[PDB]
A paper describes a structure:
The human AAA+ ATPase p97, also known as valosin-containing protein, a potential target for cancer therapeutics, plays a vital role in the clearing of misfolded proteins. p97 dysfunction is also known to play a crucial role in several neurodegenerative disorders, such as MultiSystem Proteinopathy 1 (MSP-1) and Familial Amyotrophic Lateral Sclerosis (ALS). pmcp97 is a member of the classic clade of AAA+ ATPases and is an essential cellular enzyme. p97 is composed of six protomers forming a homo-hexamer with an N-terminal domain (NTD) and two tandem ATPase domains D1 and D2 (1). p97 is an essential protein in regulating cellular homeostasis from membrane fusion, Endoplasmic Reticulum-Associated Degradation, Mitochondrial-Associated Degradation (MAD), Chromatin-Associated Degradation to NF-κB activation (2). Critical functions for p97 include the translocation and restructuring of proteins from large cellular structures such as organelle membranes and extraction of ubiquitinated client proteins to facilitate their degradation through the ubiquitin-proteasome system. Here, we present cryo-EM structural analyses of four disease mutants p97R155H, p97R191Q, p97A232E, p97D592N, as well as p97E470D, implicated in resistance to the drug CB-5083, a potent p97 inhibitor.
Despite varying degrees of differences in the ADP-bound state as compared with p97WT, all three mutants display essentially similar structures when the D1 and D2 domains are bound to ATPγS and in the state corresponding to conformation III of p97WT. This is not surprising since R155, R191, and A232 are all exposed to solvent in conformation III, i.e., no longer interacting at the N-D1 interface; therefore the mutations at these sites are not expected to affect the quaternary conformation significantly.
Residue numbers in the entry:
A (entry chain A), B (entry chain B): 12 to 707, 728 to 768
The structure:
Amino acid sequence: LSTAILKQKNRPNRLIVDEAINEDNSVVSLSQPKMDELQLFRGDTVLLKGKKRREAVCIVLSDDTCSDEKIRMNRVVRNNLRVRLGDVISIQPCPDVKYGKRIHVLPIDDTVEGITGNLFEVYLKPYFLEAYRPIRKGDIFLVRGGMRAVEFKVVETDPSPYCIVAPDTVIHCEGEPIKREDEEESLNEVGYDDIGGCRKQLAQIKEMVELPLRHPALFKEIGVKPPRGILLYGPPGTGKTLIARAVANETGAFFFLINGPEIMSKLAGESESNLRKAFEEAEKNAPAIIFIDELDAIAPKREKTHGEVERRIVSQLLTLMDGLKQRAHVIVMAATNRPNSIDPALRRFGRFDREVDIGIPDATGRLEILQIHTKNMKLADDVDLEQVANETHGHVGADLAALCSEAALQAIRKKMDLIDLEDETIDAEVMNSLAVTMDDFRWALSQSNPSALRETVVEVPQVTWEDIGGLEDVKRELQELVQYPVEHPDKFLKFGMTPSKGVLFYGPPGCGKTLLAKAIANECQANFISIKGPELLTMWFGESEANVREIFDKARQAAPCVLFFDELDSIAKARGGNIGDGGGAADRVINQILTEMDGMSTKKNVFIIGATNRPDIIDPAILRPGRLDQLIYIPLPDEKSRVAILKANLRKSPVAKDVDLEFLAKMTNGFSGADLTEICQRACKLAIRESIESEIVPEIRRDHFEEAMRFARRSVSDNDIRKYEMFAQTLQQSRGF
Amino acid sequence: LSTAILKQKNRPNRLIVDEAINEDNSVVSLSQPKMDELQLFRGDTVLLKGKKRREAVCIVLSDDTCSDEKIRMNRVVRNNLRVRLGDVISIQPCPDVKYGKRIHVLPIDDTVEGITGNLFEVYLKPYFLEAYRPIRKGDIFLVRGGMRAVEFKVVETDPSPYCIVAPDTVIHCEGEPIKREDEEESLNEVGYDDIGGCRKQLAQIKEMVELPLRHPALFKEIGVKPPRGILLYGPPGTGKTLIARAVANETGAFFFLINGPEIMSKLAGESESNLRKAFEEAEKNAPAIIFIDELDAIAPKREKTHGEVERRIVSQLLTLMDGLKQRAHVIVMAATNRPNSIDPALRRFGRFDREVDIGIPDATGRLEILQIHTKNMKLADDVDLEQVANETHGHVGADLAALCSEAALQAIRKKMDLIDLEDETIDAEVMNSLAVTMDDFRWALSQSNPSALRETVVEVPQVTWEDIGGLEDVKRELQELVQYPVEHPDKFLKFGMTPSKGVLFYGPPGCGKTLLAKAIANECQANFISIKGPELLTMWFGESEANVREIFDKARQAAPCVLFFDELDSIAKARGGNIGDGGGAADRVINQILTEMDGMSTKKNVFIIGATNRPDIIDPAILRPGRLDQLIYIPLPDEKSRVAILKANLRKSPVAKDVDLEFLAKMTNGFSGADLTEICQRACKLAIRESIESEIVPEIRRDHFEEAMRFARRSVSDNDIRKYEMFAQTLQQSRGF
Ligand SMILES: Nc1ncnc2c1ncn2[C@@H]1O[C@H](COP(=O)(O)OP(=O)(O)OP(O)(O)=S)[C@@H](O)[C@H]1O
Ligand SMILES: Nc1ncnc2c1ncn2[C@@H]1O[C@H](COP(=O)(O)OP(=O)(O)OP(O)(O)=S)[C@@H](O)[C@H]1O
Ligand SMILES: Nc1ncnc2c1ncn2[C@@H]1O[C@H](COP(=O)(O)OP(=O)(O)OP(O)(O)=S)[C@@H](O)[C@H]1O
Ligand SMILES: Nc1ncnc2c1ncn2[C@@H]1O[C@H](COP(=O)(O)OP(=O)(O)OP(O)(O)=S)[C@@H](O)[C@H]1O
Ligand SMILES: [Mg+2]
Ligand SMILES: [Mg+2]
């Protein structure tokens, strides 16, 4: 529903074109039935719209040879104009055009490379028939009679509308030929097709940029106003500049790029004039887009600033931006990488009220980035872009660009022996043999290049319910207070409660308190944030009180979200617990968590799950009825529960049928899940030890498990079982005394 | 009494006009009896006063057709001039007017759109009779003979008083027609009708602005002086700029707007001249109002300032403002969002002595804001603005503006399939089908848009006495020391005491110590401030000693107020209690609270209520006779008291008559109110679990309660009951040893 605009379906008229047996690759595709709805008369040309204001004209009504009701595929229409299939193309007439009078010929590498002669009748006579060069400023045509070597372009634009070359004219031989850099630079512009892994973010940009300007009367009738402030923020390298460069070409509005350091490097008083002129320009025309790059580099905080000239820029910006009215139709956009170093006065009502966050993509996001980035390189058949995306975790779109370059350099390293450093030019018989293989990427994933920045990742865990053995009742209970209050909200206002948000896990260590938290988030298809114990202690190093609030602020925006706190024992261990040094374990970070938890609304979908293994040093203040009410105890697995753990831990291992899984169930009594995992990890090393010494077979036998039982140590003493059971029944009574 | 001016009643002469059956909608309303009190002779026009210096003239003495003693409702008087009914309109004669001589015709979209011809006798002949265009600069009339399409306005103003067009003149055809932006911009000005949820605040502004200037002789006879400094402060987004923009149009005095960043962005020495000229202008005329926006952005603290030019502005302002005398009649107004970042020298006697605080509105306040904001949008019949106001808690007038825009965007999202992005213009047969439905707001209340700033809210709690079960004596006792010393102050000076302010609650947890504090505040119709335990610990992060004093300062101004401290155990838990690490639990925040409490006057209405559940680690210093004297102990509910708790917790649930409420009273012995609430919350989930699985009935049966008794755990041990009773009798003896 939210992304229904981007969908392109529900049209039986159109279909996918298969491979045809026709060899007619020198004619356009024209069909008769489509000719009955247009009102085109017997004119000269047909006007159509493509993309990026780039079209192409050819001979009309000349095919009548190929199949019908099918667009003929050509080897020249796949590079320009059209790039794919599934785009709606509309045509409209445009009379009162102005024909051209005099257009000269400007060659590049066709006349100077060969023979010049008269440049009129040398090779143009066999083409000047039935068409007086129907050319246009922005079209690249093709004509030759020799060795297939010709490339002609035009740069002079005398008329504003479309023009047609008239016969009986002269040739202006006093012009400068165009070089290669100019045509190459304005041919490889980026667009919406070069952005991968970001679909929801780009949907919101269109609804605020390509709708108020194109259809200004839509919002006037309703009575609402479009936003005039859009702010982009995220980690450095996500691709913020790509969005700015892509929205500047797909839209037919004026774009004015504003640099951050360029304004900051001007003289005294010169910086203030360029800002005024930028807006005085944009207010002249109705369609205008203003983009500012690195806003924080030009308008920092006014309290940590020692220079008056630096504050003058902030004052000038605050003066110029709030002076905009409705009829100006000016949209101001900005992008930065430090949302916290901003000045508070900018992100207020009227200046920057709408914000777009660019998060770190998951494997699906980076797969598309790799596919679109490696579209022109020569790849082999053993490559696999899906496998690479699984091993990369902290890689943003900037890292994938360098990874491919490193892989290409490693691939071409091995061809060092037949070329030389002092050699003049490389021979062409080895130029075509370079191809990136699978082993190239494996070496690139083991150096300092993958060493990048990695932060708190908000995504959906891949842990399923099949990886957890036993605990039938816990899984049922977890689904009755997370899945129900989200999928069917109508079941709660009828009886008249509010759902209870908050569950605390307690029990002996090594029972699987993290897999339960991940599986419930995976089942409901919600976000998951994992904050560990020591991370909160080390985060607070320079006494900053703004490093925990934005965690809740980020979790609130990504609704539904599951906020989980892991290893809650280390925090209580900082002071000691109930008595500690003499006070309590209610330290600086406990109060912030309690205050942020108490302020959450009852209509939100942010669910909080707690887990700990020290039910004797917990803070009584957190057990209040309204922060963490639910108490779930996970006991040690019994004989029946341990059957599934071994089968779940051996899914990817070729276990032989002779191994009796039920025999090891009764052998182990005081062993938890971690002990069984250790037993599996130890017993399967014997097969590797034997297989590596046999080389001077690849399957785990029965004798491998019998050897590890004499070395399997117990991790849970008999005294701890007697102590956990006491707190398993009387835990809510700890408050007060 | 305080708001008696705003009341409009006590007048039997006027009444409400109902619907009439007359179809005469082309004539003015004139009545005979009202013609006997005025002294208007047989002149030409009648002068009357409306609002915003905008009037309207028409044909006088021509109706004599409609009913009598009733103002006829018209379809053209509801847009301009008059907007409602109940305003006193007075008339006065004004002789010695100057008639006009030459007024040309300036069309907008009536002459250029069609046929021009001579522009004199084309369509104006059938109107030039019995009236020589009685027009005025500020009136919009209506005349047509075609398709009802005409809009004529005038911009040239040669005479100062009212003028009448004289016959036998010429037409000045050398003028520039007026565009659409100019007429639209000065038509939608904001006023007092666009401010909702603020009635008491606007009452004080009038008594200081629209009274000393209009009636300067009132204060001279008494011998007092009107204030010359008004400061506005509050959270960002409350609508401070609206008040400034509204008071500038409803008053007939000169207004000069002063920006904050615009002055700060000037050159060296240029900023000081604009400030001098602003006052040198205002001193010329008697009625003058000076408003400064964002005072803190121009005059910060002089100790945290590194620039000399920035301090020069503060020195210049301090020099210019105190130089004003009585006869200048100049009122200086300012508005800021950070009252603490101010310079101390400005908020003194003579510069800024009077301050207006704009608090966060309650549900009633935001309902009016929503009603006035959604006055032009197309709403459906299933909408309900009252329900939306209940779910929004931390929403200021700025947030409601964006909420409606988001709802409108969501409503128009679903119409994506019949319009296209590349389409030229939208057809008119779907332009009228857009309407906001109920489901639009539900989606808007679940995204990042409602995520706004929320602070300490001062309002009246909605908790009544019917939601509390038992405790007959506690409710009676609470009414004898809060309700009595406020409603009937005369009962205390006769016998000769001072009332005792301060009550401390102590007892086992989960008995309802917060509902008692809220109900007494609700009954007496007073404010309520809830400050929790951890909030005081986390507030003090950067060692600021000005974060607790303004809490008492704010509570003092909103008299009567009830200041309540919740969870007073965590503060004592910071050090340990009586012994702790070796010292005491009298930490940094205890002394501030004690010092602020000792300094309160005995004539104030600020009542302080304390509540805790740790009567063994309390500070003996706080039990002094004069801070917290009253000691109230809340015991566990008995069999009789628990009868009402279940009935109070099941008011919104359809409980069947077969469920015996008296059967569960004797079954529970050591269960407090929280345990019963948990039992209710657990037993009613079984009905939902059954109703969700039956779909592959909506009423709680008897078997749902019998299942939860086997899982109901006790939260109060037998040892804690024996310990609370000891302190319930000997608590005041803890002081000294
Ligand atoms: N989604 C993407 N698809 C393909 N290439 C991408 C993508 N995102 C980033 N890149 C590439 O990575 C580069 C990173 O540049 P940007 O992230 O745009 O720089 P930035 O956002 O301004 O942040 P800086 O430069 O580190 S301060 C881009 O220029 C592209 O070459
Ligand atoms: N039922 C189970 N089936 C398979 N593996 C399990 C099961 N329960 C636990 N494990 C594994 O045992 C290990 C326990 O890791 P954790 O989740 O960290 O344990 P924990 O309960 O969170 O307590 P700690 O303090 O972290 S050891 C992981 O490797 C799990 O994959
Ligand atoms: N009572 C109200 N009724 C209707 N609309 C309101 C009301 N209060 C605020 N608004 C709207 O919300 C906007 C908020 O602007 P203001 O609060 O006036 O800005 P400000 O008070 O100067 O504080 P800033 O701009 O955040 S520093 C107004 O411009 C209105 O559009
Ligand atoms: N007499 C009662 N009738 C109905 N509900 C009650 C009654 N007494 C308490 N409750 C409920 O029980 C819960 C107790 O919450 P609190 O007011 O926080 O308890 P408290 O006495 O303040 O002590 P703590 O430390 O906060 S648990 C709330 O959900 C109340 O609505
Ligand atoms: Mg773990
Ligand atoms: Mg309470």
